[PDB]
Design a binder for this molecule. Structure first.
Ligand SMILES: [K+]
Lengths: 231, 238
RNA sequence: AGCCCCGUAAGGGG
């Protein structure tokens, strides 16, 4: 029950573009085989990188060999890039784990999340850019239950979606440039579940850990909703 | 009919403290109006601000009776010393000539122009009460409901139920920028300070006028819980 | 994140 976030370190002028990255990824999916992956990209010009998250084993085993085979090779992610390395560790945004390990802990009443790219949500046939507890966490829990081994008990789900508040928020909305008339939140938000039982706190820490892989909200396949947990 | 926001230009050092400022204000009401301390919905809002050495305090009144019964005492404070936490001398009592001073009427809140958009600046920490817990994210419904509720409470008109639905259920966020800051109440919490542009899509012009009115009302009523302490001070921007 | 009270339980008052 492995999960993986593979970082492609890129050599080339310019920066990767979401439509190119997604289309390029879809090519590999056609060749090689709710979304069980997510995409991202980041860094500055000349120090850019792309990332592929894989949320189910079938996909890791299918795609990972195929990302490795591109080391040293030139791909198009908008502009042309030389993939200098495929990283599973040694990059802040690269990692590998298992589902059970998401439940490591320690359990905490608080969950600090950094939103590294514009995050928004589909709601009432509209894109909403505010990182409200219930959105962040329903989104995370929906995917974790979809690809993980556990279904949250109903009381726990209730606690997370109906009870979690915000302790602190810091940030701003930015344009989502692939979209018409859509903004997304960037910055930091610390969520707090009061009266959290140990189990609830555990589930909350797990959702926080899963965010790093699955990301948060809508159009993660375009690199939106890229998030990670912090101390 | 009338809304008024009077600003006390303060002399002395530091800033007013929330609990001291509210203490001071209920001190003044104890003689004219001891009923309001226990009323679940406040016919007023307090505020303070400024750099240190240029501090000011704010008394906002949402019903005429209080203005009548309170304004004279307030004006009488010119020249004299008040305790708003730290002691200050009251230098002036302004209705005009200060950014947070003003007067208007309820009808005049509704004189447009009506906009599908309402940009609010939250100038002091803004937060809300939900399930015995504090929530500092200014969601469309939380803000507009708190404005609308108090408009209906103290004002001459209630919005049609479809306009209410449009405002509450279908208004969204177009832009948000800011951060939470500490907020001392009877219990310590935090609240949002910064700027949010709200947008009601498919708004009828009526709805669009009610939205602009709520925006205008915010200047006197502030937003959310504990405006009695100076929290939720806000105003509409362009 | 916690006390008291209120509350077509949404949110409010101290
Ligand atoms: K009161």
């Amino acid at each position: 029950m492995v999960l993986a976030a593979l970082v492609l370190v890129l050599e080339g002028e310019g920066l990767p573009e979401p439509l190119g990255l997604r289309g390029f990824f879809y090519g590999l999916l056609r060749e090689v085989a709710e979304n069980p992956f997510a995409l991202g990209f980041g860094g500055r010009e000349g120090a850019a990188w792309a990332r592929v998250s894989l949320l189910v084993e079938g996909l890791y085993a299918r795609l990972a060999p195929r990302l490795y085979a591109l080391e040293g090779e030139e791909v198009r992610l908008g502009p042309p890039f030389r993939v200098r390395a495929v990283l599973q560790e040694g990059h802040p945004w690269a990692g590998v784990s298992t589902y059970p390990r998401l439940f490591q802990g320690p359990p905490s009443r608080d969950l600090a999340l950094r939103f590294a790219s514009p995050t928004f949500f589909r709601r009432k046939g509209v894109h909403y850019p505010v990182p409200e507890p219930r959105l962040v966490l329903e989104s995370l829990l929906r995917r974790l239950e979809a690809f993980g081994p556990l279904k949250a008990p109903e009381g726990v789900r209730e606690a997370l979606l109906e009870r979690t508040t915000v302790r602190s928020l810091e940030g701003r909305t930015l344009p989502a440039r692939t979209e018409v008339d859509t903004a997304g939140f960037v910055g930091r938000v610390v969520y707090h579940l009061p009266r959290a039982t140990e189990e609830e706190a555990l589930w909350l820490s797990a959702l926080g850990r899963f965010a790093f892989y699955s990301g948060v909200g809508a159009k993660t396949s375009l690199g939106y909703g890229r998030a990670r947990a912090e101390s």
